[PDB]
Amino acid sequence: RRAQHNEVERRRRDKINNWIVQLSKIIPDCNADNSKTGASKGGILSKACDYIRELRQTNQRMQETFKEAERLQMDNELLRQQIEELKNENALLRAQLQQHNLEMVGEG
Amino acid sequence: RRAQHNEVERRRRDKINNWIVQLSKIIPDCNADNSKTGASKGGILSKACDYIRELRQTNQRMQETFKEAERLQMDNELLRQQIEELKNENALLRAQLQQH
Amino acid sequence: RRAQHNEVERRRRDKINNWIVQLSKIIPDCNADNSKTGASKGGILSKACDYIRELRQTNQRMQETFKEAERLQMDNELLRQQIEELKNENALLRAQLQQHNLEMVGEGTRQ
Amino acid sequence: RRAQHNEVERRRRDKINNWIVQLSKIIPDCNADNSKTGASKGGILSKACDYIRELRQTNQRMQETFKEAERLQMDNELLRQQIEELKNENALLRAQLQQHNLEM
DNA sequence: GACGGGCACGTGACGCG
DNA sequence: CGCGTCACGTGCCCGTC
DNA sequence: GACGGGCACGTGACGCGC
DNA sequence: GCGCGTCACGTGCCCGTC
């Protein structure tokens, strides 16, 4: 009667534990912490719960540095122009300093 | 009594359920799919199993292109830093040709 | 008379060119940039002048994170004390809710 | 006639001197401490040749440890973010119990 | 003695082609 | 009539106190 | 024809120590 | 009381693109 219902629980409880061990086998943290708390069913959950939080953290780094990728490469064109306008004037003026400082020493 | 041991298990069961519920609240697969088996506790695990293992596979496809994308901001600082090195030399040179 | 001083200068220029190729061999950009201006003597200067700027940018970035790795103890005590303070209160108050939410069904039924 | 080619050589020799002086002004081995023998232009090259050779092995030592040191800020982001989730849940739970007309 | 906390197992309840 | 959710109890083999 | 630019090579000039 | 050793400057020439 309900003794057949005991077997359906045994199936479905076994499903959950075997889902944790598959979960356990794929988190790197559970495969290096030889402890009786990490190896617990309750540990794998809060470990994967964290693992996802950190996997979504790296993923949300990747996305965020793409919305700005067009703008900063646009900035690259700008500051790549600013170096040359400054360097040419830097070279122009260093020629205009180092060749006129010399015209004042022996001016007469 | 054993009434402390019922509370201990109830605490342990509450931590567990709050750790699939937090798990439930974050996987987009079971987010607002309202399934009778998908929203079950055993399903979130298969959904988290299929979300961790998919995010791992994703972020390695990303790191192929991301490391090259990362350098573009390193350069943005670099070439930004060059500007002041030459802006100081330019301003140094700009305030020395005055008396000639 | 000065043909011995042509020897003195040729020695010096050879030193400088071979101090460029020694430089040229140790900058990774010139090691793979088959360019007429990159392979120029003057190119190796502005390539090494950049290559140094970027290594300075890394070490001066690399160390500046150690002045703040001091604050691994900061987020320890932000993790050690704070997260359990709220989790225990979270689990406590969530149990205080759902013990009286069972009496809500007790008081008012649906028919 | 050739006066433009003299000016062109003058510009080219200016760029490389500006490139050794830009080089000289950053290598600490000759950062306004070194003599007339080491501020020699051929000497700055051997010192930049050292500085680069010496920084690559230094850079490679740091990132052996820095990689583990970096993730402390990653976790600082992580653990600072966990606080927000629990604060929202704790704020959610603290006000749903003020409608239960009994706190503790 | 004091309790905790681990994991597996039964039940009743409830919603189901 | 069996499924299948679920939380809740229950020993027990065991920890640390 | 027009200019630029590459690199090697030769000089006077200058600072030097002996 | 001159051997070195700095350095920039010119110059051919072997050669690019406009």
Numbering used by the authors:
A (entry chain A): 236 to 343
B (entry chain B): 236 to 335
C (entry chain E): 236 to 346
D (entry chain F): 236 to 339
Quoted from the paper:
Upstream stimulating factors (USFs), including USF1 and USF2, are key components of the transcription machinery that recruit coactivators and histone-modifying enzymes. Using the classic basic helix-loop-helix leucine zipper (bHLH-LZ) domain, USFs bind the E-box DNA and form tetramers that promote DNA looping for transcription initiation. USFs belong to the basic helix-loop-helix leucine zipper (bHLH-LZ) transcription factor family, which also includes the MiT/TFE members microphthalmia-associated transcription factor (MITF), transcription factor EB (TFEB), transcription factor EC, and transcription factor E3 (TFE3) and the MYC-subfamily members myc proto-oncogene (MYC), MYC-associated factor X (MAX), MAX dimerization protein, and MAX interacting protein 1 (MXI1).
To investigate the structure of USF2, we prepared a recombinant protein fragment of human USF2 from the basic region to the C terminus (isoform 1, residues 235–346), including the complete bHLH-LZ domain according to the UniProt database annotation. We cocrystallized this protein with E-box DNA and solved the crystal structure to a resolution of 3.5 Å. One asymmetric unit (ASU) contains four protein chains (A, B, E, and F) and four single strands of DNA (chains C, D, G, and H). Chains A and B as well as E and F form compact dimers to bind duplex E-box DNAs formed in pairs of C and D chains and G and H chains, respectively. In each dimeric USF2-DNA complex, the basic region (from Arg236 to Lys250) forms a helix to bind the major groove of E-box DNA. In fact, the two dimers further form a compact tetramer in rotational symmetry with a two-fold axis. Finally, we observed that Lys271 in the loop region binds the backbone of G(−7) through a salt bridge.
